[PDB]
Amino acid sequence: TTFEELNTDKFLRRWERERQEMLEARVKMTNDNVVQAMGMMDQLLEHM
Amino acid sequence: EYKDRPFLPAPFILLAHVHMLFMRLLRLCGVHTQEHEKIQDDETKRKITTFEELNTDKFLRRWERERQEMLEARVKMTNDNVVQAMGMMDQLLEHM
Amino acid sequence: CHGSDSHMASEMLHSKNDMFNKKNAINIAYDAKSLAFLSHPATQSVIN
Amino acid sequence: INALVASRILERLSTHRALQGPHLAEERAKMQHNAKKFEELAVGVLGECHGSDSHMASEMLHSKNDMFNKKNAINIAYDAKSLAFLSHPATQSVIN
Amino acid sequence: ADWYGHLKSVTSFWAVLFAFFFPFFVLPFINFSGAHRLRRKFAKFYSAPYTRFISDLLSHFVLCVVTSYFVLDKLEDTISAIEWILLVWFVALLLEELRQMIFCDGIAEYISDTWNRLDLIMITLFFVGFFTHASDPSNQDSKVVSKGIHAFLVVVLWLRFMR
Amino acid sequence: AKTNITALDELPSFALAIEELYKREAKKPHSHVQRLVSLSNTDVLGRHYRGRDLANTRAYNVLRMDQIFARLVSKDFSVNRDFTIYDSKYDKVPGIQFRRTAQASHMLFLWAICLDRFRMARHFWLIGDQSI
Amino acid sequence: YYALSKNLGPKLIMMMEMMKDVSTFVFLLLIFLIGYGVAAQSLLSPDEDFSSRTFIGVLFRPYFQIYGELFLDDLNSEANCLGDTPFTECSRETVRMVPFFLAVYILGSNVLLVNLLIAMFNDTYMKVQEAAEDLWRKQNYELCA
Amino acid sequence: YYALSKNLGPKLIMMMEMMKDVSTFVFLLLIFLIGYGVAAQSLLSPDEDFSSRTFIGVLFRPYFQIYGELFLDDLNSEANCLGDTPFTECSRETVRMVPFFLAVYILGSNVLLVNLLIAMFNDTYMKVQEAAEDLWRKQNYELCA
């Protein structure tokens, strides 16, 4: 039972890491990050 | 093809042929009968029309969402966003 | 499971489960018609 | 020669009696993977040599090595069962 | 859904064929997706395109088997009963082809289809062979030439069965 | 409301809560949960035998749903439930806090498979045990 | 007992899969065979009462002619043609069309249908070989159980 | 000495690879051949003591019938059927089933198994042609050494 739960958590961590190393996810992550980056620049320009 | 064909098989289709000829003769010369059909109500037509327009808009929204989730569009969008980001930094540096 | 400890994974696949009527997991998989599970190398190793 | 020897040792260790066991599976997999990588390195360096000076590369492949018991590198590659190295155009040109 | 008409979609080839052969024994015990019941089931089941297709198949299959028997068995010194049945059958087929010519989308649309071409060649071959036999029924040579034309008739009939 | 059946009265509060989640989903028009329960042809305890008030007011109890899912898997599914462990007399037992969680999780997971909500199914699958 | 083997077992599952393509080939060939058999049997014997031998004549040579046994000496002898060149100087001129009918038939059956069956087998093979391996792995448990 | 050539050498390595598929075909055919051979030999001679000739009769015609030599004149003569139409007017009615058994057998062997072998050869060819080229390049050094 302990072995099965540990390997279930281990597979989910490996699966999550593998899905984050895909090209589609990285391009999507990069796009959302640049959008949030301009939000932060909207704060810079306001303050300036 | 099989909707308009008479049901009676090949040897016995002569009876069907003379029956259709009898109907044509009795409608052209005799004129003792006519043709009857059914016409759909306006309510079900506007229901079909409303359904078709709603599904057209729904497909276009789904199609637009699907085209924005493609890799090429996302890379293009990311490129234009970084270009606009430097434009905003040209304003920061100017002001600074 | 098969990556971490193959023998313990074999013990896990051979364990009769009190819930589920004391059927081993391979019996469950065959009854569920899971072709992908049965064709896996770990399951095939236990069957061999 | 060291990359070929490295590929051979990892390949022989991956099927050796000391590495069989339930807990050693990933280790074994890693060995085969690393072996393959070293084989690629041996091919790559060889290719670079043949690109720079083919005749000097031929002299290099024909050189008996004092360490390694005076066997030429092609003899080492055949003994290491490196199919990728033997199928390379540089090695085949030296054999021809 | 148009193919099966007012019948359920789970109906198989054998069920519809059995219902076609046994009308009074399979129709009450069937699901349709007294004067008000029996007449309605008869008018709905036999107006379906699937039933008409099955009737045309079975009819063409009997035509092939009966015409095959006629060309294998020897011709008599007069026009036989099976010859008269086939004569009535092919006139009917010719009238059906003429009806198809009138109610299609032009002569070009009908002649584009290869099965219509096979139908015309089929009807033409039978009538040449029959008139060849019927010109001199007691002549042995006429019977031989008629069966020679009717060999071509049988091959086309079986080719036409692939529709 | 109080029930004459001893099996239904033995059920804890969270079982009634899962029954409430089934009831809310079932009251929607053309809902497949209601159709599944009606076409199952079973009584209140889920036995295949095909008291009208008891058969409609408590038609979505967890035992009956367990029997319906059991018939969906195979001919010999029989999930073993132990609702006695949720009583206060078993608090001194060491590993019971895992077990009480796990079983509960399982029941909710079955509900999440029934409504085809994959994310909650994956979450309750992760919380409980016997993953494979 | 071939199913235990890693080579013979999946191939047996694939053979059972190819039986549908074989059945498709049989349905297509029945047309050409019956059409040619009734026509050819009628041309060879045009003045004979129908019997069981007529039916046997309709199926025997056409079916075996798809396997290269052409029966040309037997067909020539049955046609009552006495010339040195085959199917010449015959009593009836219609029976001289038998080699032609045959000429169409083996073009239809061997050249067209058999090669089409080879194409269906190759496509079917590429589509369902991995599924056969998976089904063999399930049958491994079935045999073990 | 064909191995030196860039065309004949890899093809010889591939031929040695296809021998396993040939062996698979042989194992599948043995079933149909023995079943049909014992059955057909028994139908042709049902009142004969077993000898070495019975065993030779079980293997000779079935194996050679997979290559188009059907032996129908020889089978018809052996069946003691005196009719003009083949396998009619026989002494025993059971021997008239030989053409049918044969009809199943060559459907099993030529139509099904041979075409399956063509599919296995094509798949096997596409899978291991590059490996054969690599193995030929290693054998080039072996021959040079």
Ligand SMILES: CC(C)CCC[C@@H](C)[C@H]1CC[C@H]2[C@@H]3CC=C4C[C@@H](O)CC[C@]4(C)[C@H]3CC[C@]12C
């Ligand atoms: C497929 C369709 C279009 C073919 C039509 C052509 C057939 C029916 C016709 C065209 C020429 C005809 C042949 C012409 C002359 C002779 C010689 C005579 O002594 C016997 C009949 C025989 C042998 C005829 C048999 C029928 C025949 C073969």
Ligand SMILES: CC(C)CCC[C@@H](C)[C@H]1CC[C@H]2[C@@H]3CC=C4C[C@@H](O)CC[C@]4(C)[C@H]3CC[C@]12C
């Ligand atoms: C339309 C397609 C199928 C082509 C049809 C060609 C047919 C009609 C041709 C091809 C070979 C021809 C035969 C060749 C030779 C002879 C011998 C002659 O003394 C009588 C006619 C006869 C027996 C011919 C009949 C017509 C024939 C069968």
Ligand SMILES: CC(C)CCC[C@@H](C)[C@H]1CC[C@H]2[C@@H]3CC=C4C[C@@H](O)CC[C@]4(C)[C@H]3CC[C@]12C
């Ligand atoms: C490339 C391929 C398709 C060429 C086709 C060849 C055709 C036209 C040949 C091959 C065999 C031939 C037949 C062989 C023998 C006879 C019998 C003779 O008494 C009349 C002609 C007839 C009936 C021939 C007609 C033409 C024929 C059918």
Ligand SMILES: CC(C)CCC[C@@H](C)[C@H]1CC[C@H]2[C@@H]3CC=C4C[C@@H](O)CC[C@]4(C)[C@H]3CC[C@]12C
């Ligand atoms: C594969 C299995 C299902 C086939 C079963 C059918 C076999 C065993 C049966 C069905 C009909 C039978 C035949 C019926 C009649 C006769 C005629 C008689 O004078 C000799 C035996 C013979 C020729 C029988 C032999 C056996 C037979 C062919």
Ligand SMILES: CC(C)CCC[C@@H](C)[C@H]1CC[C@H]2[C@@H]3CC=C4C[C@@H](O)CC[C@]4(C)[C@H]3CC[C@]12C
């Ligand atoms: C189930 C599958 C294999 C089909 C089986 C069909 C078998 C049983 C059929 C097909 C052809 C049949 C034969 C055809 C003709 C004759 C001649 C008759 O005077 C006696 C029976 C006999 C010898 C038949 C026996 C049964 C037979 C062999």
Ligand SMILES: CC(C)CCC[C@@H](C)[C@H]1CC[C@H]2[C@@H]3CC=C4C[C@@H](O)CC[C@]4(C)[C@H]3CC[C@]12C
């Ligand atoms: C498209 C293909 C598969 C058609 C199949 C044709 C089959 C049904 C045919 C081809 C050869 C035929 C056989 C040929 C000869 C004989 C001998 C006779 O005395 C009894 C019938 C019998 C035994 C036939 C039975 C039917 C048969 C097996």
Ligand SMILES: [Mg+2]
């Ligand atoms: Mg038509």
Ligand SMILES: [Mg+2]
């Ligand atoms: Mg868990």
Ligand SMILES: [Mg+2]
């Ligand atoms: Mg041959």
